[PDB]
């Protein structure tokens, strides 16, 4: 599948993921390297992608709580893996809010990951 | 709490278990799109939310492949659980399809789903 291993974005973050035979993504996301910056990652990917040259669809979630800190928020990345290699994503980061602040609960952006720093 | 059976505004069925460790696991059945029967989901949630009245942040992913169909796509829902008399999970979602590079600009749909423990 080409997905298992370590990936790097262009802002200093890293994740290490295993792509299981059953379509599972499991691993760890580390922001820009110590234990306090590491969080559980889980997701899913298409384990039988098309053969016409299309990318492999996938997504994952990190909730920004670990043993050391809690931002009361979670990011989901939705994207596709392109081999030959990159993972091109768009993401949604939702923070827990009161109802009065719910309109401003969600940031949107995009990340590209490569196998080289 | 989060563990239970939820339905969105379209009648899709979201059966989820919230684990003590922050894990979300379960199955998703979509009432719309290139989907049939149940699909595996996994995700994460804040297992120690704030006590100031804020909702509980969470997210999960479904890859739209099961034993019946494969749409070559995945949806992620990002949102928050809001407790109360009518508990709700308010989300926004991104549905990315595998595409060629020339079609990558149109790979991703965006929307918003609200889930309650009652079917519409």
Q: Please say whether the beta carbons of B12 and B27 come within 8 A.
A: no
Q: What is the CATH number of the domain that holds A37?
A: 2.40.128.30
Smallest CA-to-CA distance from B74 within B44, B41, B45, B101 is with B41
**Is B28 flagged in the annotation as binding?**
yes
Sign of the alpha-carbon torsion through A104, A106, A111, A115: positive
Dist. CA A76–CA A92, nearest whole Å: 5
Looking up tokens 């979300």, which residue turns up?
B24
CB atoms within 10 A of CB B116: 14
- The range of the structural domain enclosing residue A64 comes to 2-117
Looking at CA atoms only, how far is residue B50 from chain A in angstroms?
Answer: 7
Nearest CA in chain A to B65: A46
State the total domains in chain A: 1
The two three-digit tokens of residue B26, written as one number: 């379960």
* Residues of chain B found within 8 Å of residue A105, distances taken between Cβ atoms: 55, 80
Q: Within a 10 A sphere around the Cβ of B93, how many other Cβ atoms?
A: 22
d(CA B103, CA A54) in angstroms, rounded, equals 9
Q: How was this model experimentally determined?
A: X-ray
What is the Cα–Cα distance from A42 to A63, expressed in whole angstroms?
A: 10
The C-alpha atoms of residue A23 and residue B62 are separated, in whole angstroms, by: 10
- What does this entry list as its resolution, in Å? 1.4
As given in the structure block, the two tokens for residue A31 are 């922001």
Interface test with A, best of B2, B35, B76, B112 (most A CBs within 10 A): B76
Secondary structure string (H, E, C) spanning chain A:
CCCCEEEECCCCCEEEEEECCCCEEEEEEECCCCHHHEEEEEEEECCCCCCCCCCEEEEEEEEEECCCCEEEEEEEEEEEEECCCEEEEEEEEEECCCHHHHHHCEEEEEEEEECCC
User: Looking at CA atoms only, how far is residue B11 from chain A in angstroms?
Assistant: 23
| Residues B64/B73, Cβ–Cβ less than 8 Å | yes
């Amino acid at each position: 599948a080409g997905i298992t291993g370590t990936w790097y974005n262009q802002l200093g973050s890293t994740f290490i993921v295993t792509a299981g035979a059953d379509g599972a993504l499991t691993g760890t996301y580390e922001s820009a390297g110590n234990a306090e910056s590491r969080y559980v990652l889980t997701g899913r990917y298409d384990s039988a992608p098309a053969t016409d040259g299309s990318g492999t669809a996938l997504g994952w979630t990190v909730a920004w709580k670990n043993n050391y800190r809690n931002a009361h928020s979670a990011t989901t990345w939705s994207g596709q893996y392109v081999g030959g290699a990159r993972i091109n994503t768009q993401w949604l980061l939702t923070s827990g809010t009161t109802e009065a602040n719910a309109w401003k609960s969600t940031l949107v952006g995009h990340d590209t990951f490569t196998k080289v720093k």
